[PDB]
Amino acid sequence: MTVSSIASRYGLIRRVQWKKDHAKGSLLLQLDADPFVEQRIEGTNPISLYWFAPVGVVSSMFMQWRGSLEYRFDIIASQFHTGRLIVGYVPGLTASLQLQMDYMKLKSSSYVVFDLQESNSFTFEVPYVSYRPWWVRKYGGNYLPSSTDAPSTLFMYVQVPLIPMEAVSDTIDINVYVRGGSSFEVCVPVQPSLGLNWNTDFILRNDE
Amino acid sequence: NPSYQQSPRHFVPTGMHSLALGTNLVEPLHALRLDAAGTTQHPVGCAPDED
Amino acid sequence: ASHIQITRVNNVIELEVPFYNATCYNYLQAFNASSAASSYAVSLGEISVGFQATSDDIASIVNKPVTIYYSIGDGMQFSQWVGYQPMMILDQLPAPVV
Amino acid sequence: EESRNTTVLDTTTTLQSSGFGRAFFGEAFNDLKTLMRRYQLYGQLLLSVTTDKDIDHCMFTFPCLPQGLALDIGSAGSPHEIFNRCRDGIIPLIASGYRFYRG
Amino acid sequence: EESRNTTVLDTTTTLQSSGFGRAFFGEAFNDLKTLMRRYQLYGQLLLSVTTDKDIDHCMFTFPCLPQGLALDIGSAGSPHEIFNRCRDGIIPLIASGYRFYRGDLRYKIVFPSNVNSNIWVQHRPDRRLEGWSAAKIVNCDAVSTGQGVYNHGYASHIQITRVNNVIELEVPFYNATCYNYLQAFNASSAASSYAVSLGEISVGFQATSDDIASIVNKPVTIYYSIGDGMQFSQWVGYQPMMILDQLPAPVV
Amino acid sequence: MDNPNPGPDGEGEVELEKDSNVVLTTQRDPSTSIPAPVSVKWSRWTSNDVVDDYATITSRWYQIAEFVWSKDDPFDKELARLILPRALLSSIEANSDAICDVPNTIPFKVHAYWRGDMEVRVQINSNKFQVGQLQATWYYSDHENLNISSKRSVYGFSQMDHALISASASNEAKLVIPFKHVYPFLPTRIVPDWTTGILDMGALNIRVIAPLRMSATGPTTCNVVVFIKLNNSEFTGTSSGKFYASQIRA
Amino acid sequence: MDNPNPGPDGEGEVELEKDSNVVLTTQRDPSTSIPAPVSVKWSRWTSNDVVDDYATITSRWYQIAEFVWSKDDPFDKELARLILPRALLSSIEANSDAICDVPNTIPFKVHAYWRGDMEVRVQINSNKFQVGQLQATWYYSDHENLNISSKRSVYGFSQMDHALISASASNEAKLVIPFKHVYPFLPTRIVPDWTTGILDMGALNIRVIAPLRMSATGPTTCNVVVFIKLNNSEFTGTSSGKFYASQIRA
């Protein structure tokens, strides 16, 4: 058992659908460049549950973290499908600037184009870029202040729209696997910002 | 973090260091002196004339 | 095996619980049981605590707090990897509300 | 396979290792197990006599397991806020990742 | 330049060095830092229950910073004479001279004797300080966030009052910063808020509400010293001082 | 020699092509064509001024152009004639945002003169069952030749070296374009001796050869994207960006 | 040791101080003051991203500020409090033209984060018969200290190291300002963790000490100009300039 030993494990985190008809400008996702990537479950419970990459979970126990991440991409597609897509990385986006994005502005910052043809999967490696040597946890114990957001944000646009043969489906499932990068590491131990699903029960302290 | 399973020492407390004693005997104190090992020193012009 | 703290001396015992099972190693997730034998295969055992106070005195002890702590004691070894079950975010938890 | 990595697409220049804060805070954290040895709350209660207990009687009992006791929010009348609020805790949280333990 | 010396006009014959009292008092004083390690009062309060506190609840909280808490004269009704009179204190006074610090802090809290109850103490680095206001002790009340209660992952320690009523804490430096601000902190950058206090200490009794009443209005002194590892950085000149013996008499 | 064993990963090897922070790839082997031997630096002969490449940013790839190529396009059909140094800026201006906005292109906002070799990749995702072909051809100083309109046809460009892109293989076309021009330097802005034809070098152009062909029910069209590295460059003639003016719309 | 022999050339020796294309000089010996030992590069610890100084342009001197200093100014009178990295941009914005226009400042339009030491020269042409004096004092993170308003006086700054400028000698005041800040890096723009106090480091400030004094018929005023080299810097966090926003007017 070891922080890295866990961090070096992909977890499925996302399932983009990628139809033929998507515009070359079309976005696919823009999840944040932090370990604490989310995957909400359709918990009908007032406290909805969430999937996490193992790296996010182990990260949750620590106030600070740093280093690169990794997103394996698995474009579940027949070889006959062909396409191309940017998976860029914009450092330093505030949420107001989270919008205004396109693949093209994205190109101004670091990015990686990829060509789906033969090999149908790869692995992007997210850079760690911050004024801060470490980085504060996104969340925290039930305590909203002191919950700084991610340094930067990932993007992925359909740089070249898919061009399937008629004999194969227009849609293509894409899966995204987070994992701690080799550089990745945390430091200060604090209250985990997460709870087990074992007992998703809670009691409001209404005074009424 | 090995557990220290071995048996604990087994003294007898007392509230005060001896009074009447005053010789070959280190006598622990809470010095108000700042230095941990400091001690009054006699300048050569302030030397104890009288034994 | 047992041990007795003297509250008058001190009101905090510092226990160590040995591993004793006729098993390779115990289950670690929440345990629904199945095999009757499987029931032995989880907890290290069962700790229990009792005051020596007589009923006349025991009343003082009523509704007194008793916190308990624990840590894995160095010798502990987790085994097989398993992915996490879904989490619940804590700061997402509802406010008490005025 | 899970840990396979088909094709790296590095952009990163080499980033200096912190040695898990050893470089700064003077201490490593990569070894999760040592973190595991920090103590955690395991349970909480108010003592509650029922029968006029004889000296023989155990006041109370509990299973002794790493996984942590089944979480006790407490009654709606008397929530144990620390579990009601500070859900679970670290050690069980890591216990979540494994199917076995010995120690 | 400040330290330039255009032209000395010596008259002095050489004066014998005292070695900073080493020659007399048997100890040097030139090393300011060792002086820094002598403890100082850091705060003072009377315990004041509000809500029928659950055992989980922290009794109170405070930012943990070298600079010293914003000075508390206390109310006109209840002056804390030591700050009302013995203004500030040494460590902050020297802290006045620098713009940065890095290192640790010692504390050694002293609980009221009369109570027997066991006492826990969290450390929460996570908390950001926010503005020089509320750089002070705070009595937590009704639980809302996890702020008001004991918390898991945070490092913590528990004194037993019955054994002893004075804990002796050590606070590690934990910041994702080169080093923290040292003067009074007006805040600016949201990030800047993390860049001051080492974190946020908090303390809670395990006493139930039925017993908690004994603890009301009990004194709790706090001390601190810089814990050896501490390092001040950039020099800064002093802000203007206020003379103490110049302070007004109580007047009959 | 064969024995395919496709995996979840897919199968074939993927070439990389890192520059700066930008990185881009293809399955296919590039169809390179190099019009000229690499240029000498030439700053020696015409600049006392501070002279510097900004390879950290200038060398980043960037998408100057992209377009559909439908089967509808007739045999000898240009899809694009990119004057290059201009179009790098003209494209950004086409995005309706300042040259300063793109890290690649800021020095031009400042420096008056420029020199340096260019690189052009022309990626494509033609489906395998699609059949057609495009030639790509750089042509120096194209503007200066008035008769070019006559030559500007596949038969013409075919005679000089040129990249090819089968629709079938969806082959990428790499394309070195070392600097050559009558004068050693290209101004980034209006200059006392000339204004017109600013920052031209001639144009890349992509006449269609074989039009897409397919089963009538097949994927009717195709797409092409063009990136341009700008390597062993040099900038000079420091100046306010205020002097700089927007590229001709083209 | 003396024997003046003034020539058509004048007489005294002139120190140079070349950087890039910029070059500037003084007759007088600079009154240097260095608040801190030179900074370590620190990119190692917080940037996978391409990281680069642009010394060819960043190191050019530039006139961030200038002003009259009349005799009318009372003893302890600030003439300027320049937050530095901000004012380099704030000044250009004060010239009502884009940051991209000035070669020194373009990378900020692009890069998110920045680090690096600063240099400040404070030249003056006080007439010799004029008498007065100005102290100059850098002060880190000035904004973060709320009590600064109290300290912000000549008695205050005098205690820390500071440059001096006699009106009489018309002495120049050189001023090293090596980077130091709580965080290793200063953002060039709004950042997810903070926005406010963007690109601050604290401020240089020039409280007057001795007010100008002269024969009543003498040259009533004086002038001061400030240049700022920006040497061993590093930029990182590549980004569209569109994300960049104008500095607070101050």
PDB file of C-alpha atoms in Angstrom, chain D residues 1-102:
ATOM      1  CA  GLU D   1      -5.980  -4.289 -19.221  1.00  0.00           C
ATOM      2  CA  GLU D   2      -6.471  -1.581 -16.614  1.00  0.00           C
ATOM      3  CA  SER D   3      -2.915  -0.332 -16.227  1.00  0.00           C
ATOM      4  CA  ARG D   4      -1.940  -0.615 -19.871  1.00  0.00           C
ATOM      5  CA  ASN D   5      -0.823   2.553 -21.535  1.00  0.00           C
ATOM      6  CA  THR D   6      -1.212   2.382 -25.282  1.00  0.00           C
ATOM      7  CA  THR D   7       0.545   5.585 -26.228  1.00  0.00           C
ATOM      8  CA  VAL D   8       1.915   8.406 -24.142  1.00  0.00           C
ATOM      9  CA  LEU D   9       1.572  11.916 -25.517  1.00  0.00           C
ATOM     10  CA  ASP D  10       3.985  13.852 -23.356  1.00  0.00           C
ATOM     11  CA  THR D  11       4.080  17.607 -23.428  1.00  0.00           C
ATOM     12  CA  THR D  12       5.500  17.982 -19.982  1.00  0.00           C
ATOM     13  CA  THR D  13       9.020  19.015 -19.253  1.00  0.00           C
ATOM     14  CA  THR D  14      10.361  17.028 -16.334  1.00  0.00           C
ATOM     15  CA  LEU D  15       8.897  18.333 -13.094  1.00  0.00           C
ATOM     16  CA  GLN D  16      10.994  18.279  -9.955  1.00  0.00           C
ATOM     17  CA  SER D  17       9.939  15.655  -7.434  1.00  0.00           C
ATOM     18  CA  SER D  18       8.896  16.846  -4.001  1.00  0.00           C
ATOM     19  CA  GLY D  19       9.608  13.425  -2.611  1.00  0.00           C
ATOM     20  CA  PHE D  20       6.110  13.746  -1.223  1.00  0.00           C
ATOM     21  CA  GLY D  21       6.784  16.894   0.705  1.00  0.00           C
ATOM     22  CA  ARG D  22      10.073  15.611   1.958  1.00  0.00           C
ATOM     23  CA  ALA D  23      11.553  18.430  -0.073  1.00  0.00           C
ATOM     24  CA  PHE D  24       9.458  20.988   1.738  1.00  0.00           C
ATOM     25  CA  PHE D  25       7.719  19.787   4.790  1.00  0.00           C
ATOM     26  CA  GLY D  26      10.604  17.533   5.644  1.00  0.00           C
ATOM     27  CA  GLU D  27       8.536  14.385   5.547  1.00  0.00           C
ATOM     28  CA  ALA D  28       7.383  11.821   3.014  1.00  0.00           C
ATOM     29  CA  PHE D  29       3.756  10.820   2.643  1.00  0.00           C
ATOM     30  CA  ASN D  30       3.974   8.266  -0.118  1.00  0.00           C
ATOM     31  CA  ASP D  31       3.904   5.479   2.422  1.00  0.00           C
ATOM     32  CA  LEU D  32       0.216   5.299   3.078  1.00  0.00           C
ATOM     33  CA  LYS D  33       0.654   2.772   5.814  1.00  0.00           C
ATOM     34  CA  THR D  34       2.416   5.158   8.128  1.00  0.00           C
ATOM     35  CA  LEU D  35      -0.500   7.505   7.681  1.00  0.00           C
ATOM     36  CA  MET D  36      -2.675   4.617   8.589  1.00  0.00           C
ATOM     37  CA  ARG D  37      -1.030   4.510  11.996  1.00  0.00           C
ATOM     38  CA  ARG D  38      -2.310   7.916  12.976  1.00  0.00           C
ATOM     39  CA  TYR D  39      -5.278   7.391  15.266  1.00  0.00           C
ATOM     40  CA  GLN D  40      -8.866   7.813  14.257  1.00  0.00           C
ATOM     41  CA  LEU D  41     -12.145   8.017  16.090  1.00  0.00           C
ATOM     42  CA  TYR D  42     -13.638   4.552  16.148  1.00  0.00           C
ATOM     43  CA  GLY D  43     -16.742   5.085  18.186  1.00  0.00           C
ATOM     44  CA  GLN D  44     -18.531   7.244  20.695  1.00  0.00           C
ATOM     45  CA  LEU D  45     -21.205   6.744  23.303  1.00  0.00           C
ATOM     46  CA  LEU D  46     -22.833   7.883  26.480  1.00  0.00           C
ATOM     47  CA  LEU D  47     -22.784   5.249  29.181  1.00  0.00           C
ATOM     48  CA  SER D  48     -26.229   3.940  29.939  1.00  0.00           C
ATOM     49  CA  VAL D  49     -26.875   1.580  32.813  1.00  0.00           C
ATOM     50  CA  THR D  50     -29.905  -0.656  32.517  1.00  0.00           C
ATOM     51  CA  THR D  51     -29.854  -3.471  35.045  1.00  0.00           C
ATOM     52  CA  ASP D  52     -28.274  -2.888  38.433  1.00  0.00           C
ATOM     53  CA  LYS D  53     -24.998  -4.166  37.091  1.00  0.00           C
ATOM     54  CA  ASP D  54     -22.882  -6.475  39.163  1.00  0.00           C
ATOM     55  CA  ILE D  55     -19.161  -5.900  39.193  1.00  0.00           C
ATOM     56  CA  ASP D  56     -18.782  -8.901  36.921  1.00  0.00           C
ATOM     57  CA  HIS D  57     -20.775  -7.267  34.179  1.00  0.00           C
ATOM     58  CA  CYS D  58     -19.189  -5.818  31.097  1.00  0.00           C
ATOM     59  CA  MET D  59     -20.524  -2.332  30.678  1.00  0.00           C
ATOM     60  CA  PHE D  60     -20.511  -2.757  26.934  1.00  0.00           C
ATOM     61  CA  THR D  61     -18.991  -4.625  24.031  1.00  0.00           C
ATOM     62  CA  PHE D  62     -17.934  -4.172  20.464  1.00  0.00           C
ATOM     63  CA  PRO D  63     -16.431  -6.028  17.531  1.00  0.00           C
ATOM     64  CA  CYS D  64     -12.839  -5.038  16.869  1.00  0.00           C
ATOM     65  CA  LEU D  65     -12.355  -4.558  13.153  1.00  0.00           C
ATOM     66  CA  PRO D  66     -10.214  -2.320  10.906  1.00  0.00           C
ATOM     67  CA  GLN D  67     -13.053  -1.604   8.548  1.00  0.00           C
ATOM     68  CA  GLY D  68     -14.618   0.651  11.125  1.00  0.00           C
ATOM     69  CA  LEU D  69     -17.935   0.075  12.830  1.00  0.00           C
ATOM     70  CA  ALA D  70     -21.075   0.547  10.804  1.00  0.00           C
ATOM     71  CA  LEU D  71     -21.368   4.287  10.709  1.00  0.00           C
ATOM     72  CA  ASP D  72     -23.430   5.851  13.448  1.00  0.00           C
ATOM     73  CA  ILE D  73     -25.049   9.138  12.576  1.00  0.00           C
ATOM     74  CA  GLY D  74     -26.967   8.703  15.791  1.00  0.00           C
ATOM     75  CA  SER D  75     -30.665   9.341  16.261  1.00  0.00           C
ATOM     76  CA  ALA D  76     -32.439  12.203  14.561  1.00  0.00           C
ATOM     77  CA  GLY D  77     -33.020  13.330  18.102  1.00  0.00           C
ATOM     78  CA  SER D  78     -29.349  12.963  18.927  1.00  0.00           C
ATOM     79  CA  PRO D  79     -27.129  13.025  15.871  1.00  0.00           C
ATOM     80  CA  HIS D  80     -23.475  12.250  16.386  1.00  0.00           C
ATOM     81  CA  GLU D  81     -22.471  15.190  14.307  1.00  0.00           C
ATOM     82  CA  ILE D  82     -19.019  13.915  13.627  1.00  0.00           C
ATOM     83  CA  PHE D  83     -20.419  11.017  11.656  1.00  0.00           C
ATOM     84  CA  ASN D  84     -23.468  12.945  10.664  1.00  0.00           C
ATOM     85  CA  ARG D  85     -21.121  15.513   9.261  1.00  0.00           C
ATOM     86  CA  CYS D  86     -17.527  14.357   9.121  1.00  0.00           C
ATOM     87  CA  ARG D  87     -18.564  11.202   7.342  1.00  0.00           C
ATOM     88  CA  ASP D  88     -16.589   8.016   7.888  1.00  0.00           C
ATOM     89  CA  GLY D  89     -12.923   8.800   8.266  1.00  0.00           C
ATOM     90  CA  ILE D  90      -9.584   7.964   6.720  1.00  0.00           C
ATOM     91  CA  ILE D  91      -8.771   4.444   7.757  1.00  0.00           C
ATOM     92  CA  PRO D  92     -12.055   2.936   6.690  1.00  0.00           C
ATOM     93  CA  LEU D  93     -11.787   4.982   3.549  1.00  0.00           C
ATOM     94  CA  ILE D  94      -8.597   3.226   2.609  1.00  0.00           C
ATOM     95  CA  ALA D  95      -9.991  -0.040   3.840  1.00  0.00           C
ATOM     96  CA  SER D  96     -12.481   0.449   1.055  1.00  0.00           C
ATOM     97  CA  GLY D  97      -9.765  -0.347  -1.441  1.00  0.00           C
ATOM     98  CA  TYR D  98      -8.926  -3.842  -0.311  1.00  0.00           C
ATOM     99  CA  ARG D  99     -10.636  -7.141   0.152  1.00  0.00           C
ATOM    100  CA  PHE D 100      -8.404  -8.535   2.848  1.00  0.00           C
ATOM    101  CA  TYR D 101      -6.281  -7.607   5.791  1.00  0.00           C
ATOM    102  CA  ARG D 102      -4.010  -9.249   8.283  1.00  0.00           C
TER     103      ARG D 102
END
